[PDB]
Amino acid sequence: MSVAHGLAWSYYIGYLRLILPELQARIRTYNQHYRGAVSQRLYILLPLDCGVPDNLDPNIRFLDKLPQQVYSNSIYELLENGQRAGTCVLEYATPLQTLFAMSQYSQAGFSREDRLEQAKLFCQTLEDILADAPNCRLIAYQESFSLSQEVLRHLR
Amino acid sequence: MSVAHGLAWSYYIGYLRLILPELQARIRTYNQAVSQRLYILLPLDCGVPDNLSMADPNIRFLDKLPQQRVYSNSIYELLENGQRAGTCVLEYATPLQTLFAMSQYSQAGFSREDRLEQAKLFCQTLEDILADAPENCRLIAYQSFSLSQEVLRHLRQE
Ligand SMILES: CCn1nc(C)cc1C(=O)/N=c1\n(C)c2cc(C(N)=O)ccc2n1C/C(C)=C(\C)Cn1/c(=N/C(=O)c2cc(C)nn2CC)n(C)c2cc(C(N)=O)cc(OCc3cccc(OC)c3)c21
């Protein structure tokens, strides 16, 4: 019954439930067609400070788009000690942009303290929705800091 | 900090604030009449059908609103006494689909009574965001029934 609950349900109903059923087959088509294979599962970055940059760290490099289906998903390499240590489909949780905007607009009556509480609640709520819906993994973190090491810990 | 508050802000930040600044130029290009506002249908029961061009016999698809993301918007004629009584850009408020889904799934802990309360609060919150937003968008909230008469009542106020 919070801001976070509506955002988690909208993100699941309006996006994840529509793209997750076909993701495994798209990754497989990419790996079969074309060092190291693209890991299965969609990795969602959840910066709890709600700082979502315009273009997804020196050790996270874009490689290619995945074959569509009107969904654009990107494959990245993760570097460790300067070399490729993993490859995966990665993307930011867009509802955290709305939490950031609500903290910025006075009309929302939503403080930066409310924002962090709702970001944590969004992560927990989304985790619980996905646990009850049998190809996805949430990477929550609060930002020196290495995002590549954060993703690599989940991949391994 | 209610469910409605987050849905109204996501719908504004992630859709309306991006589409509304170019709406007047798109309507002007088609007219050069179609009303100057985006009319958003808000069925408070949260029943959003798959196709608006088949929702009412007196709401007929006229044309796609041209370009001046690439947004797809539709222009409809509203009939009264079998004749064109108004023309406007019309579409359903998609966040009401999430309110419907939350009432359907036990995990959400969200009753049909909560759904209607949040649907009304979503309408109020969105109207207040749009009233103060930068200087073209009207909300049509409603619960035999004529949807064309509902839209025409709003159009005739403008
Ligand atoms: C919606 C689920 N969701 N809930 C929360 C919380 C956050 C998210 C979320 O972030 N959603 C998405 N992600 C991460 C996505 C990633 C990918 C990918 N991998 O490529 C692809 C799609 C993705 N979507 C779906 C989006 C962005 C829409 C459907 C936007 N949209 C929209 N929105 C609303 O209903 C809504 C309700 C609430 C509440 N808040 N909103 C605003 C978001 N309406 C009416 C739209 C109408 C039109 C029109 N008139 O034709 C067009 C739209 O968008 C054309 C478009 C085209 C291409 C790229 C593009 O942007 C990528 C957008 C409309």
Q: Is B26 known to sit in a ligand binding site?
A: no
Query: Which residue type does B16 have?
Result: L
Of the candidates A79, A61, A51, which has an alpha carbon nearest to the alpha carbon of residue A143?
Answer: A51
B10, B48, B70: which to mutate for ligand 1, most atoms within 8 A of CB? B10
Coil, strand or helix: which one is A35? coil
Of the candidates B64, B13, B143, B62, which has an alpha carbon nearest to the alpha carbon of residue A50?
Answer: B13
Residue B84 pairs in a beta bridge with B79
Nearest CA in chain B to A129: B107
Q: What angle, rounded to 10 degrees, do the helices at B3-11 and A95-104 form?
A: 90
What's this structure's resolution in Å?
1.5
How many angstroms does the Cα of residue B71 sit away from the middle of ligand 1? 11
How many angstroms does the Cα of residue A15 sit away from the middle of ligand 1? 8
Q: Which fold has domain B3-155?
A: Rossmann fold (3.40.50)
CB atoms within 10 A of CB A48: 19
Task: Look up residue B120 and give its two tokens.
Answer: 């009304």
Cα separation of A14 and A113, whole Å?
27
In order of A99, A146, B14, B89, B137, the CA distances from B20 in angstroms are 21, 39, 12, 12, 8
Cα separation of B158 and B148, whole Å?
16
How many angstroms does the Cα of residue A32 sit away from the middle of ligand 1? 30
Contact B3, A5 (CB under 8 A): yes
Q: Which of B5, B16, B69, B126 to mutate to test the interface with A (most CBs of A within 10 A)?
A: B5
In order of A125, A155, B2, B92, B111, the CA distances from B118 in angstroms are 18, 39, 8, 16, 10
Using CA positions, which residue lies closest to atom 48 of ligand 1? B71
Q: Is A70 known to sit in a ligand binding site?
A: yes
Q: Do B6 and A1 touch (CB under 8 A)?
A: no
A5, A15, A102, A125: which to mutate for ligand 1, most atoms within 8 A of CB? A15
Burial class (CB in 10 A: 0-12, 13-18, 19+), A30: middle
Cα separation of A60 and A106, whole Å?
35
| Sign of the alpha-carbon torsion through B102, B106, B109, B111 | positive
Q: Is A134 on the interface with B (CB under 8 A)?
A: no
Structural Rg of chain A based on CA atoms? 16
Helix intervals (H) in B12-157: 17-31, 95-104, 112-132, 147-155
Residues 6+ apart with CB under 8 A from B41: B52, B90, B91, B92, B93, B140, B142, B147, B151
Q: Do B98 and A3 touch (CB under 8 A)?
A: no
Report the residue from A3, A10, A132 with minimal CB separation from B1: A3
Our measurement of the distance from residue A14's CA atom to the centroid of its chain's CA atoms, rounded to an integer in Å, reads 15
Q: Is A111 known to sit in a ligand binding site?
A: no
